[PDB]
Each structure stands twice: as structure tokens, then as C-alpha cells.
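Quick sanity check, Hepatocyte growth factor receptor:
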Amino acid sequence: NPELVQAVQHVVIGPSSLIVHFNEVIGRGHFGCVYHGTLLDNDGKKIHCAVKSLNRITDIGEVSQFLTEGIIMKDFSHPNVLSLLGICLRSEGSPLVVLPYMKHGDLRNFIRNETHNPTVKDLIGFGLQVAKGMKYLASKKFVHRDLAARNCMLDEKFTVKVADFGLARVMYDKEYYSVHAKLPVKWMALESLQTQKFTTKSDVWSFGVLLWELMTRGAPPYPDVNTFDITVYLLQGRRLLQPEYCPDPLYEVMLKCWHPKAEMRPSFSELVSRISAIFSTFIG
Ligand SMILES: C#Cc1n[nH]c2c(-c3cn([C@@H](C)c4ccccc4)c(=O)[nH]c3=O)cc(F)cc12
């Protein structure tokens, strides 16, 4: 579609400014690989970036959706949302996503690493930052669908940036199940498991699970509940139990995130207000 080609031009980065270090692999996933990259500005200043390949994107429909997603995400400008520097649509090679490099990697690996010692307050602070980034994304009507601690990055100042190192995004929820690479079952809202649909309210459910990952320092949720038994576990009214070091008011926030009625779950704006009040009770 020629109009889509013209609209996406401002998102495109090419060999005139980007060098992909294809032998410097940062990470490998089902979507493809993540490589170190260097972007040069007009004064020759170097910008360290991460370059994610989206191997699934090959046919004209997928490529059009990729261009649409790049236009949408190029507009992102919020301290707790990972910016999209640009995209590369090479004549030869799979499409590439150009992101700012994140010095401290993903939030899950960070809190799980035994050499790190984040306090309960630092963990609540990371949750508050994620809630702010999700309040921004929700205001843009952007439904994440894969919010989890593994998908939130930490920059050189320990600022949390909501990001996505999962499968290439789909425009429609009906394409999501087909495209999956396991579904993030243990982060999904009850209605997404049953009806295959995703909304900002199902992102709120995932945020509650992400808060649980933070308070357990990256423990796998429902380790003892098989993926195929999660839907029934949630129907029996059962939930993730309160982590040992999770304050009661923050566990109450998690319970509201997992309300069986999506319309009754708090909004991200309410979560920012509530978690800010809880965070303010911790000294340090
Ligand atoms: C089709 C398709 C795509 N699938 N994913 C894409 C991306 C991508 C974006 N971002 C950041 C801008 C982000 C994402 C979601 C929420 C907050 C911040 C990532 O972190 N990873 C990505 O792969 C960029 C893009 F131009 C196209 C696609």
C-alpha cells in the first residue's frame, strides 16, 4: 500500500546511520536474535542500541503490519516506555527493530541474580515505574499482551522501560493464538484464556502477576500449576499467594488486578496513585 510506505518513512533507519554488529549477539529468542548495534548521529556521536530481528515477518500482510506497528511505536515518548529508534527493512534479511541499549538488561534477570540485593522498597519502586509506563501505553490504546518482568528493561540509571522481547506483534487478537513459542498463560487474564481477547484490563491482570514476580525476586508464578490447568485454577477462585516480603496493601492491589470481572480491575492511573501511596510508606 503506497500510503503506508510513505507514512512509515520517518521510522526507517538504514546503512547511512546504523551498523549492526551481527557477531555480537545480546540474546536469542523464538522471534529471532538481538544484536549490539551502533547508530551515528549527524555529528558522528555514537548511540549504543539493541537490534531485534523479527524472523516471522516475511509476507506482504505481515510486513504491512510491521510497518503499522513501527509508526505506532515510533510515537512513544515516556520515561518508563522503551523508545523505538527505528526499523530496518532490508532488501536482503529479516526486518529489524532498533531499540535503545539497556545497560542493566531485563528486570527479571536483575532481581533473580543472587549478587544483586534490591530492597523491598526498590522492588515496589520498579512496580510503580512499570505502572507509569502502562498508564502511558493505555492512554494510547496500546494493548501490550505480553507484560511480564522479563519484558521490562533497566537502563544505565536503573529506570524501568516497558518493552517487548517476545514474538512479533499481531494487529488482531485472533492472530495471537495462531502465531504462538508458548502463550504467556501464567500472565494472562481469565477472559483472555477463555475468549482469546486482550484489552488494557487484561494488561492490568498481567501487571498484578508482574508485581508478584517483583515481590518474590523473580520466582516463576504457579510453578506447581500446569499451564493446561491454570484456567480451572483461576475459575475455582484461586490466586497467587502472598509473597513472604510483600506488604499487605500491595497484595491487596494484586488481588484487585486479578478480579474475575475485567471492568472491576483498577486502571493503570489508579494503580500509579495507589502504589505511589504505598511506596511513600517505605523509608530509604
Ligand atoms: C510486527 C511487529 C512488531 N513487533 N514488535 C515490534 C517492535 C518492538 C518494539 N518495542 C518497543 C518500542 C516497545 C514495545 C512494546 C511496548 C513498549 C515498547 C520492543 O521492545 N520490541 C519490539 O519488538 C517495533 C516495531 F517497529 C514493530 C514490531
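Posting the structure with no commentary besides this: The pocket of W49 is lined by residues 52, 54, 57, 65-66, 69-70, 73, 76, 81-82, 84, 87, 97, 99, 144, 162-164, 168-169 (CB under 6 Å).
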